Coordinates of C-alpha atoms in Angstrom, one line a residue:
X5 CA -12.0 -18.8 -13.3
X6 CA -9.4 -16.5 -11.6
X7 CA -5.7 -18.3 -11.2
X8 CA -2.1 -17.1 -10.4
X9 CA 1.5 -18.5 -10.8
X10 CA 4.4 -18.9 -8.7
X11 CA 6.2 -16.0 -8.6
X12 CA 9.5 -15.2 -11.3
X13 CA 12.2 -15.4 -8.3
X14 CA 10.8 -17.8 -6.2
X15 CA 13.4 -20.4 -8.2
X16 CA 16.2 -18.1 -7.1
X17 CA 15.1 -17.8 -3.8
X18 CA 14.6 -22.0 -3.1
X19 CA 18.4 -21.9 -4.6
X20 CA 19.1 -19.3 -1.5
X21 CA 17.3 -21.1 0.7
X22 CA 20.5 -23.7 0.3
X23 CA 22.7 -21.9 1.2
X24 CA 24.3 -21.4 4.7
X25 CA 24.4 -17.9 6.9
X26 CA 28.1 -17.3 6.2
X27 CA 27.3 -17.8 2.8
X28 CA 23.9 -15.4 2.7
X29 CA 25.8 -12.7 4.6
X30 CA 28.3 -12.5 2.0
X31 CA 25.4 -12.1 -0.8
X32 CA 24.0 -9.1 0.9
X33 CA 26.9 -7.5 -0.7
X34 CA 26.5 -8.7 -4.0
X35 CA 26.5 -6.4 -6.7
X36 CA 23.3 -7.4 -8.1
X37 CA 20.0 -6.0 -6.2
X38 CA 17.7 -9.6 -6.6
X39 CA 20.6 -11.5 -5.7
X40 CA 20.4 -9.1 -2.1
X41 CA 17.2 -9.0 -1.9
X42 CA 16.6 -12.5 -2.4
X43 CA 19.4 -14.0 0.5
X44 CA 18.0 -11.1 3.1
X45 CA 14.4 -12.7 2.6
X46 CA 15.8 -15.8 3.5
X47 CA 17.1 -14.7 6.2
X48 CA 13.9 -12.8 7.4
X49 CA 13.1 -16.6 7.5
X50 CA 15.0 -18.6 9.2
X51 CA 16.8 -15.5 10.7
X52 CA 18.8 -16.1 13.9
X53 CA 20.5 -14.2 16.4
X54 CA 23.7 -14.2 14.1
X55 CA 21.4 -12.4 11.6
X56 CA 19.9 -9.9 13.7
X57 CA 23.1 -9.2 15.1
X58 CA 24.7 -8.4 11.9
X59 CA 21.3 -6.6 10.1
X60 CA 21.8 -4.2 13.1
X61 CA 25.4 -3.6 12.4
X62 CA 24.7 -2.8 8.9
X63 CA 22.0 -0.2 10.0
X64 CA 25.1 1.8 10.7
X65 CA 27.2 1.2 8.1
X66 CA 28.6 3.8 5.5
X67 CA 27.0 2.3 2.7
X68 CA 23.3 2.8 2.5
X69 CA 23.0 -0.7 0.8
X70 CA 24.1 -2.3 3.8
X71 CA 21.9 0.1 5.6
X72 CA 19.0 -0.6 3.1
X73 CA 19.2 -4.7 3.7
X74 CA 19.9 -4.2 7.6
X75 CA 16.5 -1.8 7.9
X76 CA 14.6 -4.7 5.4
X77 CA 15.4 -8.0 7.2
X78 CA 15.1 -6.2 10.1
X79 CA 11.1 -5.5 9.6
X80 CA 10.6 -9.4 9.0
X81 CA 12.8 -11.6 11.1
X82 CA 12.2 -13.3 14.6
X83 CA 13.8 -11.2 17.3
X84 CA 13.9 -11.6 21.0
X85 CA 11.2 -9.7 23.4
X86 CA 14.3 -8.3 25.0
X87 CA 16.0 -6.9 21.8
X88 CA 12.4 -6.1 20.9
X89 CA 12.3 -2.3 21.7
X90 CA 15.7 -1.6 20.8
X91 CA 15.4 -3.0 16.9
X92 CA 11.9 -0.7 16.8
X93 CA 13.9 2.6 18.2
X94 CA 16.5 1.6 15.4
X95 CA 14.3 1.5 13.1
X96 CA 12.5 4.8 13.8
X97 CA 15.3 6.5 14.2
X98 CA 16.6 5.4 10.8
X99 CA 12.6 6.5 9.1
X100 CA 13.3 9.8 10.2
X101 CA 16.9 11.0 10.6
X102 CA 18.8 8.9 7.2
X103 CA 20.3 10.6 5.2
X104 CA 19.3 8.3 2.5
X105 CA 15.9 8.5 1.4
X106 CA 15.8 5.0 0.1
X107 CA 16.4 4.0 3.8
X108 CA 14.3 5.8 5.4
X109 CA 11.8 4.4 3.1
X110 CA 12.3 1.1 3.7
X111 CA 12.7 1.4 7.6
X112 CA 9.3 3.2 7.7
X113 CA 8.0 -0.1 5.8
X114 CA 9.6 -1.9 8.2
X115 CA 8.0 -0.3 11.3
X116 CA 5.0 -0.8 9.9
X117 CA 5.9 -4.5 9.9
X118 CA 6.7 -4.4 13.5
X119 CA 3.6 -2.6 14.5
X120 CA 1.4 -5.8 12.5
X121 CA 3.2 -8.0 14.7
X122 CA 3.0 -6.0 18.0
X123 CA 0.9 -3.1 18.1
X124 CA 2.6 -1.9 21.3
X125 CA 4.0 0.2 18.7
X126 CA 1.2 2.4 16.8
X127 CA 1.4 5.1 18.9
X128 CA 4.9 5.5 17.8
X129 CA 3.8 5.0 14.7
X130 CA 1.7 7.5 14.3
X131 CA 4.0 9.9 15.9
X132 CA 6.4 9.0 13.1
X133 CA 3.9 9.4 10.3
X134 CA 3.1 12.8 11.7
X135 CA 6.6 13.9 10.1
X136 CA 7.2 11.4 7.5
X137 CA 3.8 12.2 5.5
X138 CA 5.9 15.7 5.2
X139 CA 9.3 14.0 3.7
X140 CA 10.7 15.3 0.3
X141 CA 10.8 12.3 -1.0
X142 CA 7.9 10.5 -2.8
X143 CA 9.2 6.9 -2.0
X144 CA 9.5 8.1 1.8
X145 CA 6.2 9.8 1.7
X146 CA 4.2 6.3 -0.3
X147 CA 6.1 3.9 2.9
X148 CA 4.5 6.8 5.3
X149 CA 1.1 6.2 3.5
X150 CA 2.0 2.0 3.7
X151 CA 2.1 3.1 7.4
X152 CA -0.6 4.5 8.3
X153 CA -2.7 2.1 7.2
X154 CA -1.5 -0.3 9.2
X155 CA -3.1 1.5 11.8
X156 CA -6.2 10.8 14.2
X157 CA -4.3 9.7 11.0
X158 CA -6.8 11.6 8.9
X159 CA -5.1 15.0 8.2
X160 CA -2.3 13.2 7.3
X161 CA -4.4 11.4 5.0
X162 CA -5.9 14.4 3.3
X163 CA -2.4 16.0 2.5
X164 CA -1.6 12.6 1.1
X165 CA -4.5 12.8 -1.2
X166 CA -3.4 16.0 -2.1
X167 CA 0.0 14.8 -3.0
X168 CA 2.1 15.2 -6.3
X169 CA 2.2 12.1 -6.3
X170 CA -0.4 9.6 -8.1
X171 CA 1.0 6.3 -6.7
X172 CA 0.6 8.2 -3.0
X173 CA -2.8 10.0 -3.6
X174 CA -4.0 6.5 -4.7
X175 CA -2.8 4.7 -1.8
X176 CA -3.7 7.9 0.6
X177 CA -7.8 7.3 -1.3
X178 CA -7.2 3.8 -1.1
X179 CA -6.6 3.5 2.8
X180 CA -9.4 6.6 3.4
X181 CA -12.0 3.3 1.6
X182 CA -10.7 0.9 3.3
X183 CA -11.1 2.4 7.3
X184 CA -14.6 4.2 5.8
X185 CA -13.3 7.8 7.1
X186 CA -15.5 10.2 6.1
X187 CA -16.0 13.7 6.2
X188 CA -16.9 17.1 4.6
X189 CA -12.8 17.9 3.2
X190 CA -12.5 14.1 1.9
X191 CA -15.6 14.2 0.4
X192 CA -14.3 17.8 -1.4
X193 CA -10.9 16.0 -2.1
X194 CA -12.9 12.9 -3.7
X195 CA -15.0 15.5 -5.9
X196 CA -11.8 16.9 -7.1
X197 CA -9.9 13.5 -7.5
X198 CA -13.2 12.8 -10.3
X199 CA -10.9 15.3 -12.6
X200 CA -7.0 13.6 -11.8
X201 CA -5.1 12.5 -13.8
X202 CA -4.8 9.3 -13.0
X203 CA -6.9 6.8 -14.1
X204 CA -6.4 4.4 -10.8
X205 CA -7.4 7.6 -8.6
X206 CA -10.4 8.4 -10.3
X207 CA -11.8 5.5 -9.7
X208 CA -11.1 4.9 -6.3
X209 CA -13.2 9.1 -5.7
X210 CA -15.7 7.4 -7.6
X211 CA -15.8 4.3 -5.2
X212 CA -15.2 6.6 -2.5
X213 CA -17.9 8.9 -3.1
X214 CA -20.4 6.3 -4.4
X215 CA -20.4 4.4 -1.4
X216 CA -20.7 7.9 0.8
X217 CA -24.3 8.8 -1.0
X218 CA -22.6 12.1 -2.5
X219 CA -24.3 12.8 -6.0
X220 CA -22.1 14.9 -7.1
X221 CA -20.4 12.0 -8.6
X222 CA -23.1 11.5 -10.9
X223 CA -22.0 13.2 -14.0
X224 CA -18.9 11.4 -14.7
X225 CA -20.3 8.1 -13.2
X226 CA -22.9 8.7 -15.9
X227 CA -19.9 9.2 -18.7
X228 CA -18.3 5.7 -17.2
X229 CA -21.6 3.8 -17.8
X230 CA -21.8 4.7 -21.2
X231 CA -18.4 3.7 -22.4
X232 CA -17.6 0.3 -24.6
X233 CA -15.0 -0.8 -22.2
X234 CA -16.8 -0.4 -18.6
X235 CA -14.8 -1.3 -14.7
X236 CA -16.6 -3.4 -12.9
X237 CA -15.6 -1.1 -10.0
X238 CA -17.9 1.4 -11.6
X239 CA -20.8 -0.9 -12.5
X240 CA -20.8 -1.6 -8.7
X241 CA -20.4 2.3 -7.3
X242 CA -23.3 2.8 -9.6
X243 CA -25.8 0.5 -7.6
X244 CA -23.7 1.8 -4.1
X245 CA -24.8 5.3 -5.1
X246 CA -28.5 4.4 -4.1
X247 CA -29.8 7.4 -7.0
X248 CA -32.0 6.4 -9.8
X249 CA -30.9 8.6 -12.3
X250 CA -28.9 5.7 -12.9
X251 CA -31.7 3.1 -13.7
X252 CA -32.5 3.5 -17.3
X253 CA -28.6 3.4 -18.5
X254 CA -28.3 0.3 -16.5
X255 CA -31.1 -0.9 -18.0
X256 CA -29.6 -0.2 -21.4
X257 CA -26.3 -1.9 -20.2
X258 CA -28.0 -5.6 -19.7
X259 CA -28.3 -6.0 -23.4
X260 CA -24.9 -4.6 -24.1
X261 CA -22.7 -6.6 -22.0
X262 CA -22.8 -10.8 -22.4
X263 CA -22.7 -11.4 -18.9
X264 CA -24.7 -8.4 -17.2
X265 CA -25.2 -10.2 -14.0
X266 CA -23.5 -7.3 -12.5
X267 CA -25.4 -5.1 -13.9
X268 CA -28.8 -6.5 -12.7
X269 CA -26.9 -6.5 -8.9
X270 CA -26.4 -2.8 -9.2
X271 CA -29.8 -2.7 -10.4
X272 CA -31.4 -4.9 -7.6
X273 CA -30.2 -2.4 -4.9
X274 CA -31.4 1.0 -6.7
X275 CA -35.2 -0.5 -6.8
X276 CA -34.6 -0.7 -3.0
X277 CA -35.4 2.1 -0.6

């Protein structure tokens, strides 16, 4: 059933794709963001010494949109083992010490990029995220959470779930799922996350504390069941949960929805044990 289409610039960046490096190199400077954007990912590409080269130059330039576009092809592009190190330290520097929080954003993303490719580098990584979790700036501390996982990271974790951010606390919740961390303060932080604000981050606490056994999610998992609109995500938690309080709504719920296939899953497991 599920589909997708071809991204909106790919068009414009087959067009770039035409072009030669001289001609790329001069579009980094264009005045139009997508226009940048688009040339330095085709230089990620096919990227050659020339390009490396000259994306390191423009880590030090004056203009933080050079330096922006230097730190961004330079998390993607081929590079020598021998220039290797040197484009990592570059870009950690840059993560930590710009004085432009947009570059220090992106250079964090494109660590993390590095590390994917080469582990060698987590350690550093983590070293980095140890400070960058703590940046002023939301966009800097959202790359730190990209970061981390990509690779204990924990505490940082937890005071990204406790950000002012929802965007971050999301992604912070999101990456706590995904490695299955668990403990006492995230399972506190999860119980508090049932009341935010955000939509998205209530429901990854109630994933979260679903699929850790913790009943105190009960109550508003209870409240989600019996809307008109109900996530799937929730359906599913419900049968993660493993409590049958949950049983008879469920029950109710199979000759509510059309397709309650779901539903019956959730159902399936709660009989069990």
């Amino acid at each position: 059933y599920q589909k997708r289409k071809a991204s909106k610039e790919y068009g414009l960046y087959n067009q770039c794709k035409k072009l030669n490096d001289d001609e790329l190199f001069r579009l980094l400077d264009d005045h139009n963001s997508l226009k940048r954007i688009s040339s330095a990912r085709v230089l990620q590409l096919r990227g050659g010494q020339d390009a490396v080269r000259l994306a390191i130059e423009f880590c030090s330039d004056k203009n933080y949109i050079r330096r922006d576009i230097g730190a961004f092809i330079l998390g993607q592009i081929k590079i020598c083992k021998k220039c290797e190190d040197n484009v990592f330290n570059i870009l950690n520097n840059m993560a930590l010490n710009d004085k432009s929080a947009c570059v220090r954003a992106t250079a964090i993303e494109s660590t993390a990029q590095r590390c994917k490719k080469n582990p060698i580098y987590s350690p550093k990584i983590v070293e980095q995220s140890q400070i960058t979790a703590f940046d002023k700036s939301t966009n800097v501390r959202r790359a730190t959470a990209f970061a981390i996982s990509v690779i204990a990271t924990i505490p940082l974790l937890i005071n990204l779930l406790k950000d002012p951010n929802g965007d971050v606390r999301n992604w912070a919740a999101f990456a706590i799922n995904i490695n299955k961390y668990d403990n006492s303060d995230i399972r506190d932080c999860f119980v508090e996350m049932l009341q935010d604000k955000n939509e998205e981050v209530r429901i990854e606490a109630i994933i979260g504390l679903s699929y850790r056994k913790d009943k105190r999610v009960l109550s508003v998992l209870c409240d989600e069941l019996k809307k008109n609109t109900v996530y799937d995500d929730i359906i599913e938690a419900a049968g993660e949960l493993g409590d049958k309080t949950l049983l008879p709504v469920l029950d109710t719920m199979l000759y509510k929805f059309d397709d309650n296939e779901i539903i019956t899953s959730a159902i399936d497991k709660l009989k069990r044990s």
